[PDB]
Amino acid sequence: QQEIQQRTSDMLTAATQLVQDWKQVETQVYTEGT
Amino acid sequence: QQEIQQRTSDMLTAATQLVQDWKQVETQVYTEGT
Amino acid sequence: QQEIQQRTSDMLTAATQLVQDWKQVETQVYTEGT
Amino acid sequence: QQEIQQRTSDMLTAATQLVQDWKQVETQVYTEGT
Amino acid sequence: EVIDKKAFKDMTRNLYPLNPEQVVKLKQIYETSEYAKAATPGTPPKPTATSQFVNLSPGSTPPVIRLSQGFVSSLVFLDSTGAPWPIAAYDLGDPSSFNIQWDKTSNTLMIQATKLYNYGNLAVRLRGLNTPVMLTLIPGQKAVDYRVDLRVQGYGPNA
Amino acid sequence: RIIYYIQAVIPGRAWLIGSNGSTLTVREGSKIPGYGMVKLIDSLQGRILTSSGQVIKFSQEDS
Amino acid sequence: RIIYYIQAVIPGRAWLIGSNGSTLTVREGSKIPGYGMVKLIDSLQGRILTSSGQVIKFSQEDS
Amino acid sequence: RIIYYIQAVIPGRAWLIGSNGSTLTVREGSKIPGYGMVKLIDSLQGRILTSSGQVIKFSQEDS
Amino acid sequence: RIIYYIQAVIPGRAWLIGSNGSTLTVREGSKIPGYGMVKLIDSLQGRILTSSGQVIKFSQEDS
DSSP states (O other), X not given: OHHHHHHHHHXXXXXXXXXXXXXXXXXXXXXXXX | OXXXXXXXXXXXXHHHHHHHHHHOOOOOEEEEXX | OHHHHHHHHHHHHHHXXXXXXXXXXXXOOOOOOO | OHHHHHHHHHHHHHXXXXXXXXXXXXXXXXXXXX | OOHHHHHHHHHHHHHOOSOHHHHHHHHHHHHHHHHHHHOOSSOOOEXXXXXXXXXXXXXXXXXXXXXOBTOEEEEEEEOSSSOBOOEEEEEESOTTTEEEXXXXXXXXXXXXXXXXXXXXXXXXXXXXXXXXXXXXXXXXXXXXXEEEEEEESSOOSOO | XXXXXXEEEOSSOXXXXXXXXXXXXXXXXXXXXXXXXXXXXXXXGGEEEETTSOEEOBOSSOO | OOOEEEEEEOSSOEEEEETTSOEEEEXXXXXXXXXXXXXXXXXXXXXXXXXXXXXXXXXXXXX | OOOEEEEEEOSSOEEEEETTSOEEEEOSSOEETTTEEEEEEETXXXXXXXXXXXXXXXOSSOO | OOOEEEEEEOSSOEEEEETTSOEEXXXXXXXXXXXXXXXXXXXXXXXXXXXXXXXXXXXXXOO
16 A cells, blocks of 8 residues: 555656656757858 | 724724825926927 | 634735725826837 | 545645736837848 | 556646646636726726817806826817917826826827826916916716817917 | 706716807706706716706717 | 627627728617617627617627 | 638637638638538647538648 | 658658659658558558558668
């Protein structure tokens, strides 16, 4: 029974990092040459 | 009996703010244009 | 009985924020262009 | 019984974050080129 | 092997306490609350444009301007022929209830009311006149004046 | 006759405009030509009661 | 006749446009030529009830 | 006849393009020429239900 | 006939190149000329299943 609550806390830490990485979108870069 | 004395203190607070607002008269403003 | 007193105090916080927002009137802005 | 009050407090935290995100409106940006 | 299915569904409910159905229902609650907040009691005033003649006799009554809180009313001054009459100066009583914007040379005043039911008066001096023109300003009526054209009895610098 | 219309009303006074372009102001006890004596000034709902039974209101096209 | 369409509506008022290009604004009790009396201004769903039974709504191509 | 194709769809609206190059926008209750009345706008999967039984979808070469 | 070869594959899409130099992109349900309907896009191992029974893979000299 108590192994379910230990496994649930492990998955919540990993899922918070996965969702936070999917939020990040970097702005495009325009390079002008002459 | 004691609910009358509670109601009297609430009306005295509201009547003090109402009388103080009626005292305020703002000075006229003269605007010159050229 | 005590659930009425808990519900009433929640309505004072909501009504005070509603009345204070209705008092606010912003000054007009005149823009000159040349 | 007690699991209802635990679930209710979790939903209030998520609903407060959702409401203030809908309140935010960004100003338009005008770009002049020459 | 069956623990992994049990731990995944309880993790999902902690990560997302609101269903996609419940997010949609919460958005309808929020915009209905803003609709009741912005609604005005009674009926809103009718937006109108008017035109009056101003008599400088010592028997007549001063003209009336209808205002509304947060709205702009523009007053333009004309002579008896209809040409514009530029404004020299003005004097406003109770500046806590009304706000006036004016470029220093034109003939148009723009007045916004700040309070709901407080009324006052205003004095306007024109360029060629010695007699000042006196008005009264009452807000909170069933009509709001978007623009008032005022005919003044004399003759201005343009004719 | 001459039809009078309410232009602006506060508690106590009322400003009236006639079909001739004439402008009046009235109090609780006052004379209106062609109407008689003012009986009641009702600042809410825009009604003025007159001793002859006629009711002066806002104009239909300006309200 | 002349067909009227709702241009904008808030609680209380409604702005109408006609097939002639004429523009109107109406209240709860008001004059409409060719329709009669305003009976109910219902700001949600864009419906105006009229005493002759006709319903003034938003235009089909502008909604 | 004229074949219509879905160009973009959100909940509520849908933007359509025809074989003539004409562009339309439709709501839940709306008229489409040659098709009838919109019955259901289903924003997922790109399907629009019509009262005549035809289904308007995305184009085969543009999807 | 024309022989198609896999150029790049991700989950969902696949980019193809033909013997004529023509380039296509396909989804799960799509048409390929000379092959029929796409039945399964399997991003691992570079295999695409087709309704006619043929299998489109990477080119032998380019893999």
